[PDB]
Amino acid sequence: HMALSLANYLAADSAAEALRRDVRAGLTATQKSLPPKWFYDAVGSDLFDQITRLPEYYPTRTEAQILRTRSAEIISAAGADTLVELGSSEKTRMLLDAMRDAELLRRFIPFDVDAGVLRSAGAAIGAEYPGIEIDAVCGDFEEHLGKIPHVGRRLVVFLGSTIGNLTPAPRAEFLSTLADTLQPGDSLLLGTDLVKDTGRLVRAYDDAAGVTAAFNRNVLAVVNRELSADFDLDAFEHVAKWNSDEERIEMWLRARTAQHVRVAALDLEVDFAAGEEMLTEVSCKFRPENVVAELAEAGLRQTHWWTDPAGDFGLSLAVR
Ligand SMILES: CN(C)[C@@H](Cc1c[nH]cn1)C(=O)O
């Protein structure tokens, strides 16, 4: 039902400030870009949820299968009574069920950008696990990790390879910051999508049904609405690329003809040449050996490594 603690560090004026800043900088760069965090308004979050069920998008179900078959082992290794989830599901329940089965579950700490979603989880989870304490935190995981409570022995999970949506420099910064908040008896469960057949990688971000394309183009709808811009969404083509040098998927939006875009709120006018491409997201893919090193660099020791038989996806347990 309604039992909940919820702390909110996301102000609408701060969000507006950041978007203006991001869009001005991104659209005036010789190589245009937009940060992917702006994908996730209500519509875009819905579209991502649909992406997780696409035939081509293996990551969610691959990760879920690993959690499904190793839930007990993960929870036994963590020895936690508190689950901290950065980014909010079926995956969630597997972990919580295992903690409950082990008679360890005391507390659930969801960390997400949408307070509404957090409130819904508080009710659902509160109902599913009677007596559980729920302390929700509305924040962005790049700035408010220090606001996460430290009560209990905490299993901090960052699933879905969302860590791959940060380029190396901010990624290392995030991991270090996160590691610094862990006490003895705390653990990090990190999901990393792994280097694999490049055809499979591109198809996962360029599905036949055009759902990912809609997800990508929606960032233009967000800008149109929030900054009073006039992007013609239909004029932009969805492009997914494998960058072999950086070993990352990239999502681009390509102007199929010359476009003139006015962003009224920024007193800004911007031009796209025919065939000009704008970078909207990276999805970095990892090699198993490099996951160990990136954790070590952040001050975390990898104590467990779970991966599906095909080696498509990896889950790390790590501690200070
Ligand atoms: C959120 N992150 C894990 C997703 C974002 C995504 C999914 N499809 C397109 N972009 C990924 O990089 O796979």
Strand partners, 301: 319
Amino acid at 13: D
Look at ligand 1, atom 2, and give the residue with the nearest C-alpha.
Answer: 162
Q: What residue owns the CA closest to ligand 1's atom 8?
A: 205
CATH 3.40.50.150 in the chain, residue ranges:
1-12+58-196+286-320
In this structure, which residue's CA is closest to atom 3 in ligand 1? 162
User: Which option is the CATH number for 1-12+58-196+286-320: 3.40.50.150, 3.90.190.20, 3.40.50.300, 3.40.50.10260?
Assistant: 3.40.50.150
C-beta separation of 109 from 135 below 8 A:
yes
Q: Are strands 133-138 and 5-8 parallel, antiparallel or unpaired?
A: parallel
CA of 283 to the centre of ligand 1 (A): 6
CA atoms of 77 and 55, how far apart (whole Å): 32
Q: What distances in angstroms separate CA 14 from CA 18, 265, 286, one per listed residue? A: 6, 15, 33
Q: Which atom of ligand 1 is nearest to the CA of 283?
A: 12
Is 57 known to sit in a ligand binding site? yes
Task: Using the CB atoms, write b or e for 35-47: b if 16+ within 10 Å.
Answer: bbbbbbbeebbeb
Q: 209-219 burial string, b = 16+ CB within 10 Å, else e?
A: eebbbbbbbbb
42-51 and 211-227 are packed helices; what angle lies between their axes, rounded to 10 degrees?
A: 170
The residue whose CA has the least distance to atom 12 of ligand 1 is: 283
Query: Cβ < 6 Å from ligand 1: which residues?
Result: 51, 59, 160-162, 164-165, 205, 212, 281, 283
Query: How remote is the CA of residue 104 from the centroid of ligand 1, in Å?
Result: 32
- Measured in Å, residue 211 CA sits from the centre of ligand 1 at 12
Reference 247, options 294, 287, 207, 306; nearest CA is 287
